[PDB]
Symmetry: D2
Subunit: 275 residues, 4 copies
């Protein structure tokens, strides 16, 4: 039943496993109804969406925990969580963070080597503090590297090896621009590799068939839905403010039955009927 076991189970059943970001509980339920087997909580999303703040280390662990509980309290899909760099320079912080996130209901989390990026040894220690704090061995500790933004592939691969040896269960190579690169991290790391297919990034919009050819274990789409959600919302605000009526925007609105079906409204009423 362990959410961590659920995540790993998802991986074994889907390759590459599509993991979509869910900005809130409602969207996690939509993703589930769409067929997805796992979801994601973006840190930049918590900041930009939940707090309306830029992703400049302004949001706190508590902001993230709150969204983790909301999402997992109602959606059973294993949730991968963006734990940034650990929320705290102290090892105690990295540890309290890992335990808090797991306790909030997350199935997995990824911690990065950013400060520019810290040294291999540094990250290796962070990873160790994380693996140590974990209680449920099935809970996934993913190690993310942003080395490709400031270093070369070879250097990034060197880290990838040290991060795995450090205990990292899976690898998250950021900003990969070539399909062949994914293959090299896989062959070198020997653990599941996640491809971050976020739009407006350096990484091309690879298809799942392309990622599969590169042995990619996971395809992540962190803010996709959020992005379309914002545009549609903005449209409603503009049209409504210009015409003094939302009449010409009704057509792009989820209906009552659709909303109700996504949140299992009828099922709740059913239980009441039974009484």
């Amino acid at each position: 039943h362990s959410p961590g076991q659920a995540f790993r189970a998802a991986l074994a059943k889907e390759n590459p496993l599509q993991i979509v970001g869910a900005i809130n509980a409602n969207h996690a339920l939509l993703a589930q109804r769409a067929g997805y087997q796992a979801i994601y909580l973006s840190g930049g999303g918590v900041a930009a969406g939940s707090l309306g703040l830029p992703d400049l280390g302004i949001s706190t662990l508590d902001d993230v925990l709150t969204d983790i509980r909301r999402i997992t309290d109602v959606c059973p899909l294993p949730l991968l969580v963006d734990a940034d760099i650990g929320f705290g320079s102290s090892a105690f912080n990295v540890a309290r963070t890992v335990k808090s996130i797991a306790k909030a209901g997350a199935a997995a989390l990824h911690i990065e080597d950013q400060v520019a990026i810290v040294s291999k040894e540094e990250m290796v220690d962070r990873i160790r503090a994380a693996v140590d704090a974990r209680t449920d061995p099935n809970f996934v500790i993913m190690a993310r590297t942003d080395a490709l933004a400031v270093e070369g592939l070879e250097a990034a691969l060197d880290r990838a090896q040290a991060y795995v040896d450090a205990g990292a269960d899976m690898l998250f190579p950021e900003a990969i621009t070539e399909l062949s690169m994914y293959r090299r991290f896989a062959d070198v790391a020997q653990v599941p590799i996640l491809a971050n297919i976020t739009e407006f990034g350096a990484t091309p919009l690879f298809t799942t068939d392309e990622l599969r050819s590169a042995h990619v274990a996971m395809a992540l789409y962190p803010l996709s839905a959020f992005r379309a959600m914002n545009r549609a919302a903005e449209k409603v605000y503009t049209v409504l403010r210009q015409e003094g009526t939302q009449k010409n925007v009704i057509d792009i609105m989820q209906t009552r039955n659709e909303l109700y079906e996504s949140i299992n409204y009828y099922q709740f009423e059913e239980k009441l009927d039974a009484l």
Copy 2:
């Protein structure tokens, strides 16, 4: 500063005052950029959006307070909050609720007589307890009622005046299909009336001009933006799952520059 004043001022410079719901802090900033002068925190939205639950009284005051702080901590627009029956029951419950919501950063809130509905008497105490707990007199205490559709016009208007005599600063009649109804409340209650122009309900999609002729002081669009964001999010999930790529939905996605600007990324 007093958001209660900002709210009162807003109704003064805009008639009817358009108040749009904002499901989260981000959308509050969007509504602000769109030019709105006041926003709303829908209770059904906190449940459906923040919790992914139906509007069956499962959400808690704390769930609501979290969204209030998030929104009001970054957006200065006056926020009207849906506080239901006070989530408690006794006088001290309504007070703690009103105080908490005010402390959280809201500018106004509305409580309702919907338990069937409570007797005129208990609603009167409800309003009194609410008004008494108020610290800043500029904080708005709105009363929402459904007596019209339950007891009838005569009874509805009776409650209306009572609710006003109890101290309610504004009235929120629910499920109004005829504009005449709004006028009767405005003439009887003689306090700013709010029209809930939500979609897929029993109320027609009245325009701002139509509401003005009915003497409506506020036009409410509780979930409008929310409904559109869900359809858009659903479209993205569906296409991505079918096609294995989001290439064909990029066109309906807010761009990086657009996002960064809505949250003043460059300013930081």
Copy 3:
């Protein structure tokens, strides 16, 4: 799992002494004193954490925060006072049960308070609670004040119905004879908890006495909390009257004792 730890403590101690801990610190003091299980008093969350009377003012969120604080640092299984489920519908009870378990609790008790609800209503609450539980080892205890409110027959009839409904253990109030506890144990056929709180109508039974009565758990809900309030008050009064705390230094836990209790040096 916490539920397993609770049942493990129960299987190894008879009766199992369960002491209330008002906060994380005291949870550690209890652990150091040798207790195998601790308690989170609902009245303690209200009076201690909120400074309010136990009259339905505290919320589920207040309780959850204390559960996380305590269980994040103390591994002793924690029994939680979930009042009536913090809501009327089975939906509320369901959300409450999952949240409390998620926060780290090992068990919780729910009561038939409204006077009390009908046997049928409580049966539904219990079923809703049992249905919401995911880990069968998580304990769902039924608390009932039927003996005092309705009488022996009513209490025993309800006790049986509550067990059939899925309640793992029973918390019957107002019993004043060890012989009556045996009767409840024989009829319910599930572990019985005896509330040994102070200043009430019930006797301060010893663990040996409770054992002779077939009582499985002995509860001391606010015992430590009571002694802590008196000591704190003594400090405040002397300090105020004398302009220094010199004369109350002798009743203070030392810095070394504090450090020892929270494993300061270990972290250092």
Copy 4:
């Protein structure tokens, strides 16, 4: 409608003003009933009491905000809060922290030059960041410093003036063991001075009369009640576990009537 004003008024009314720590809402009420005009939320107390953790930077702002709301939601006494260094490291972090603490209900807070201590310039920027985030000019921003011990008197007095010029409404200087030294700091800073009269420390247990003679504006007792409550609780746990009954500690327990009275039980039941 300003806890900041209430704090300043308490200062003017009582000199030195006794500020006692309250580990939770209940004790805030006990302090209020004992007659105190201001209370304190110790950072060390939030960690050791609310979290059962050492005061080594493990607690978060959220843990503090929760206790602030709980306390100020029921007790009207102005509350001074220990905000450490602003929980974070950026000007945006100090600002968000200052704002949230005030929004949570506090009347004042203090930040320190702790990193060794940061440079005078570093601290000056923190203070300025806090003062600018402040929405109510009455909300008090206190600067805590341990420069006397770390860098010596010349440097400490220098930072003090610099901190005040930066906007600190009050000063909280550590490591002072002599009245004459408090006197000197007060003369230089020209703002209200707080003396930390915590126990089991280097500082003597100065009396209010002695502190008044030292130009000290506030007397702080950060964990006094907390210390006594822990010992009492430990006593109950121990005796109870050892004897299988709490009969022999009933004598040191606050009764139910006393508890009810301290939290105005009957005034609420009157409303119910």
